[PDB]
Amino acid sequence: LEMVYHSTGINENAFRLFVTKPEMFGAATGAAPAHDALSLIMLTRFADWVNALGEKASSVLAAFEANSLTAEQLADAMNLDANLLLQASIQAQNHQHLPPVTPENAFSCWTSINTILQWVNVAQQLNVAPQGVSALVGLDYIQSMKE
Amino acid sequence: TSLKTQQEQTQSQLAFLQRKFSNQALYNWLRGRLAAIYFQFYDLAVARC
Amino acid sequence: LYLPIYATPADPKALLSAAVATSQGGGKLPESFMSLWRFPHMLENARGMVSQLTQFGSTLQNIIERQDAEALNALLQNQAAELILTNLSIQDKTIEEL
Amino acid sequence: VSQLTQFGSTLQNIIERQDAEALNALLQNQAAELILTNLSIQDKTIEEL
Amino acid sequence: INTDVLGKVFLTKYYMQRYAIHAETALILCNAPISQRSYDNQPSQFDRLFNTPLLNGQYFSTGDEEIDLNSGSTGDWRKTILKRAFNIDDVSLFRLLKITDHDNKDGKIKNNLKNLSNLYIGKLLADIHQLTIDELDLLLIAVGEGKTNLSAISDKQLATLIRKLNTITSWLHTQKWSVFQLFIMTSTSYNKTLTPEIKNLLDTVYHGLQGFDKDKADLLHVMAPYIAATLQLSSENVAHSVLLWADKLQPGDGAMTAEKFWDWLNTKYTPGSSEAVETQEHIVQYCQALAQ
Amino acid sequence: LMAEQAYRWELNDDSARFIKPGAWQGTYAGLLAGETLMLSLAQMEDAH
């Protein structure tokens, strides 16, 4: 578990938070955190996102450990448009993810934040708004589940 | 590829510089706390003299 | 007949590191105990005890400094060891160039 | 007074360590910034080839 | 030909030299509407900007219909035409709309030529300075002229705004400074979230200033060393000057000063514990202002 | 604090307390703790 902590590169207090409250990191509720590779990769991604936040990371992590973090604060932290993050969160809420994303966890849990950031990354890869990705994912033309 | 690796090695060493105990911030706090103690102790010393 | 346009890669992104701080709760004073000695004696006693604590604090600071100078010292050799492999590959492939 | 002199020697040691560590941190920021231009030069040498 | 037209030919010659842009683009920069007329056997500016290439066999032209610029509205083909012409996404399109006009309560705008010209003016303001819409907005806020609307502005005021933007961009380029750094240094709104650094600052100040007597010595001078230690300063008097500047600024939504900060720390602060305090957000704002 | 009791007995000043909490801070490994306590004792002797 030392080899875990050092290899992941996560900050000491976010590692403390991960150990104490796996639910905040979106691990299955009521269970001890896993050192499974599936959890290792998400821990590494969390550490990379914290490093990307730069100097803002100190406030971002504190607002994340409280139920305080919002779209606007995180947008200021990542130097992104607040409307962009708000609409990415809206699109994630509208679409059926697993686990589901709801306004009371969209920035409280790390998994919901990762889903919102994935929406933002895919939108900026396509150089379109998240509504563009929402229009794209509606083109399920090879299925019988829905029209 | 070697130069890109050197960029990572410089970032890892810079991160170790900021993340360690005995970074800049500890010495700044040590200086401020000790300077305040030093002046407060100075007034008592001169009064005793 | 058409000569295609060629794309030039952009400058590399400046890597950024995150430095967060840690906070710990302050202590609380224990319960004071009535002594037997008069004030000048219990003061020479406590002052001695405190100066011993300051001496442990100076030893502790010296340990702190040496521990992290030695962690940097060990780190630099791992970086050098890893940097050498690419130079070996370059030199070998220069031979193939000749 | 001898206690004050001892606080003064600790304070001087703190002064010295604080600014040696501020130089130590500065050098890594300069190295990190100097690396980017070398990466651009190496990439553009590839375009030369 | 008269004083008015001859006044901005010098301006367009300046913009075409300074920015190396085309004549029509410089005229747009001179607060001139996009020209529907096509001459010199060339497609017009409106046609080149919007109509070509034709999108799904639909021809775009000025009309009385109303077009929505709300990013989440998922507008019709006209919004797509605007996005393609401006090479921007929906969120940045709404941001550009907010930049251009401060009187547009809703995202919907009239499809007349004047609004399109205003949007093109706003887009070219960022294009000529090698900034996108986000840095353009943050720059205009950092300047202080962001309050003024581009839609309702005088020609001389627009020229002054152009000169200010060019000068500040040149200064930032000389200083190796990002627009975000300038915005942070010039920012007034402060995040009201407790941080470990701010908590450590509060703990150090409370412990050092405990037992302080108002008449014995100045509060600011006594508080300066702990602020210097906590906020990573080389010199103590730098912290003293910063504290004086903060007292003159009175940071935050609840105007905060050294006396108020010390009283709050003395009364309502318990170090080492995480508790919710009504004034704690103002304390955080004051600490953020000191760090800034 | 044991010296605090002695001072509050030799002088009737049961209210006067000189040793203050927070001399140990776990953020900074408790460094300078003894120099804060020593300053407190120097103030206590000066007042005594």
mmCIF file of N, CA and C in Angstrom, chain B:
data_model
loop_
_atom_site.group_PDB
_atom_site.id
_atom_site.type_symbol
_atom_site.label_atom_id
_atom_site.label_comp_id
_atom_site.label_asym_id
_atom_site.label_seq_id
_atom_site.Cartn_x
_atom_site.Cartn_y
_atom_site.Cartn_z
ATOM 1 N N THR B 1 12.966 11.993 -27.797
ATOM 2 C CA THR B 1 12.422 11.188 -26.706
ATOM 3 C C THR B 1 13.232 11.379 -25.427
ATOM 4 N N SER B 2 14.558 11.421 -25.556
ATOM 5 C CA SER B 2 15.432 11.713 -24.419
ATOM 6 C C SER B 2 15.188 13.105 -23.839
ATOM 7 N N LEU B 3 15.006 14.107 -24.697
ATOM 8 C CA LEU B 3 14.754 15.458 -24.196
ATOM 9 C C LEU B 3 13.385 15.551 -23.524
ATOM 10 N N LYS B 4 12.391 14.852 -24.075
ATOM 11 C CA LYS B 4 11.078 14.834 -23.448
ATOM 12 C C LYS B 4 11.162 14.156 -22.092
ATOM 13 N N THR B 5 11.993 13.114 -21.985
ATOM 14 C CA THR B 5 12.188 12.468 -20.693
ATOM 15 C C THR B 5 12.822 13.440 -19.708
ATOM 16 N N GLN B 6 13.779 14.245 -20.184
ATOM 17 C CA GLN B 6 14.437 15.204 -19.302
ATOM 18 C C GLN B 6 13.451 16.228 -18.761
ATOM 19 N N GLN B 7 12.476 16.621 -19.583
ATOM 20 C CA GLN B 7 11.392 17.485 -19.111
ATOM 21 C C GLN B 7 10.607 16.864 -17.956
ATOM 22 N N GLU B 8 10.294 15.571 -18.061
ATOM 23 C CA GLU B 8 9.637 14.850 -16.973
ATOM 24 C C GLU B 8 10.523 14.739 -15.739
ATOM 25 N N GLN B 9 11.816 14.499 -15.923
ATOM 26 C CA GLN B 9 12.720 14.396 -14.779
ATOM 27 C C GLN B 9 12.877 15.735 -14.060
ATOM 28 N N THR B 10 12.887 16.837 -14.811
ATOM 29 C CA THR B 10 12.903 18.166 -14.202
ATOM 30 C C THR B 10 11.596 18.479 -13.484
ATOM 31 N N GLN B 11 10.465 18.029 -14.024
ATOM 32 C CA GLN B 11 9.199 18.209 -13.314
ATOM 33 C C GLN B 11 9.116 17.349 -12.059
ATOM 34 N N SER B 12 9.592 16.109 -12.120
ATOM 35 C CA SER B 12 9.608 15.251 -10.938
ATOM 36 C C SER B 12 10.505 15.812 -9.839
ATOM 37 N N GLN B 13 11.684 16.325 -10.196
ATOM 38 C CA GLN B 13 12.530 16.951 -9.182
ATOM 39 C C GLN B 13 11.915 18.243 -8.642
ATOM 40 N N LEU B 14 11.287 19.054 -9.500
ATOM 41 C CA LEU B 14 10.623 20.259 -9.005
ATOM 42 C C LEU B 14 9.480 19.895 -8.063
ATOM 43 N N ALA B 15 8.718 18.856 -8.415
ATOM 44 C CA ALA B 15 7.626 18.421 -7.559
ATOM 45 C C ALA B 15 8.170 17.933 -6.229
ATOM 46 N N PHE B 16 9.308 17.232 -6.246
ATOM 47 C CA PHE B 16 9.869 16.774 -4.981
ATOM 48 C C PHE B 16 10.296 17.963 -4.133
ATOM 49 N N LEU B 17 10.801 19.016 -4.785
ATOM 50 C CA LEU B 17 11.189 20.227 -4.069
ATOM 51 C C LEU B 17 10.004 20.884 -3.379
ATOM 52 N N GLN B 18 8.866 20.967 -4.070
ATOM 53 C CA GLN B 18 7.692 21.579 -3.445
ATOM 54 C C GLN B 18 7.008 20.667 -2.429
ATOM 55 N N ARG B 19 6.941 19.369 -2.713
ATOM 56 C CA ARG B 19 6.197 18.428 -1.882
ATOM 57 C C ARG B 19 6.911 18.037 -0.594
ATOM 58 N N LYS B 20 8.241 18.078 -0.564
ATOM 59 C CA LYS B 20 8.953 17.637 0.628
ATOM 60 C C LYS B 20 8.623 18.505 1.839
ATOM 61 N N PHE B 21 8.716 17.892 3.015
ATOM 62 C CA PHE B 21 8.952 18.617 4.255
ATOM 63 C C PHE B 21 10.354 19.213 4.233
ATOM 64 N N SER B 22 10.505 20.404 4.827
ATOM 65 C CA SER B 22 11.677 21.268 4.639
ATOM 66 C C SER B 22 11.683 21.918 3.261
ATOM 67 N N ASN B 23 10.503 22.085 2.673
ATOM 68 C CA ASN B 23 10.325 23.015 1.570
ATOM 69 C C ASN B 23 10.426 24.470 2.040
ATOM 70 N N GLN B 24 10.314 25.371 1.061
ATOM 71 C CA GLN B 24 10.291 26.812 1.301
ATOM 72 C C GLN B 24 9.299 27.227 2.385
ATOM 73 N N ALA B 25 8.091 26.661 2.370
ATOM 74 C CA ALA B 25 7.030 27.147 3.253
ATOM 75 C C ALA B 25 7.336 26.876 4.724
ATOM 76 N N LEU B 26 7.941 25.725 5.025
ATOM 77 C CA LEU B 26 8.333 25.450 6.402
ATOM 78 C C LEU B 26 9.371 26.450 6.885
ATOM 79 N N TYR B 27 10.358 26.772 6.050
ATOM 80 C CA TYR B 27 11.378 27.715 6.492
ATOM 81 C C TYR B 27 10.824 29.129 6.607
ATOM 82 N N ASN B 28 9.858 29.501 5.762
ATOM 83 C CA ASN B 28 9.232 30.812 5.906
ATOM 84 C C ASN B 28 8.480 30.919 7.228
ATOM 85 N N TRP B 29 7.739 29.868 7.587
ATOM 86 C CA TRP B 29 7.042 29.873 8.870
ATOM 87 C C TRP B 29 8.022 29.858 10.033
ATOM 88 N N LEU B 30 9.101 29.087 9.904
ATOM 89 C CA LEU B 30 10.101 29.027 10.960
ATOM 90 C C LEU B 30 10.724 30.394 11.183
ATOM 91 N N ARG B 31 11.026 31.101 10.093
ATOM 92 C CA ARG B 31 11.599 32.437 10.192
ATOM 93 C C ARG B 31 10.635 33.405 10.860
ATOM 94 N N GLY B 32 9.366 33.404 10.448
ATOM 95 C CA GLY B 32 8.430 34.354 11.036
ATOM 96 C C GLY B 32 8.168 34.087 12.509
ATOM 97 N N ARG B 33 7.957 32.818 12.864
ATOM 98 C CA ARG B 33 7.681 32.471 14.254
ATOM 99 C C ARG B 33 8.888 32.772 15.130
ATOM 100 N N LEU B 34 10.087 32.436 14.649
ATOM 101 C CA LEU B 34 11.277 32.671 15.446
ATOM 102 C C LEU B 34 11.587 34.156 15.551
ATOM 103 N N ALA B 35 11.355 34.928 14.488
ATOM 104 C CA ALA B 35 11.613 36.363 14.558
ATOM 105 C C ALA B 35 10.706 37.036 15.583
ATOM 106 N N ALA B 36 9.427 36.644 15.610
ATOM 107 C CA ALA B 36 8.520 37.176 16.625
ATOM 108 C C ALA B 36 8.957 36.781 18.032
ATOM 109 N N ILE B 37 9.371 35.524 18.209
ATOM 110 C CA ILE B 37 9.854 35.097 19.518
ATOM 111 C C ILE B 37 11.124 35.850 19.884
ATOM 112 N N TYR B 38 12.016 36.047 18.917
ATOM 113 C CA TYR B 38 13.293 36.699 19.166
ATOM 114 C C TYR B 38 13.116 38.133 19.638
ATOM 115 N N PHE B 39 12.206 38.881 19.012
ATOM 116 C CA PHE B 39 11.996 40.258 19.454
ATOM 117 C C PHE B 39 11.302 40.309 20.816
ATOM 118 N N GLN B 40 10.317 39.427 21.034
ATOM 119 C CA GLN B 40 9.648 39.399 22.330
ATOM 120 C C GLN B 40 10.620 39.026 23.445
ATOM 121 N N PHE B 41 11.502 38.058 23.190
ATOM 122 C CA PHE B 41 12.530 37.692 24.157
ATOM 123 C C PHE B 41 13.551 38.809 24.331
ATOM 124 N N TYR B 42 13.767 39.612 23.286
ATOM 125 C CA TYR B 42 14.735 40.695 23.385
ATOM 126 C C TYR B 42 14.268 41.746 24.374
ATOM 127 N N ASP B 43 12.974 42.067 24.348
ATOM 128 C CA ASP B 43 12.493 43.092 25.273
ATOM 129 C C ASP B 43 12.662 42.648 26.724
ATOM 130 N N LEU B 44 12.372 41.374 27.011
ATOM 131 C CA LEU B 44 12.572 40.842 28.356
ATOM 132 C C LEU B 44 14.045 40.831 28.747
ATOM 133 N N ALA B 45 14.926 40.490 27.803
ATOM 134 C CA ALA B 45 16.356 40.450 28.100
ATOM 135 C C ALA B 45 16.880 41.835 28.450
ATOM 136 N N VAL B 46 16.500 42.839 27.662
ATOM 137 C CA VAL B 46 16.970 44.196 27.920
ATOM 138 C C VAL B 46 16.386 44.724 29.227
ATOM 139 N N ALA B 47 15.119 44.407 29.509
ATOM 140 C CA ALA B 47 14.533 44.799 30.787
ATOM 141 C C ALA B 47 15.282 44.182 31.963
ATOM 142 N N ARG B 48 15.668 42.908 31.850
ATOM 143 C CA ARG B 48 16.482 42.265 32.885
ATOM 144 C C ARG B 48 17.876 42.888 32.988
ATOM 145 N N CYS B 49 18.442 43.323 31.865
ATOM 146 C CA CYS B 49 19.752 43.969 31.898
ATOM 147 C C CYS B 49 19.670 45.305 32.635
#
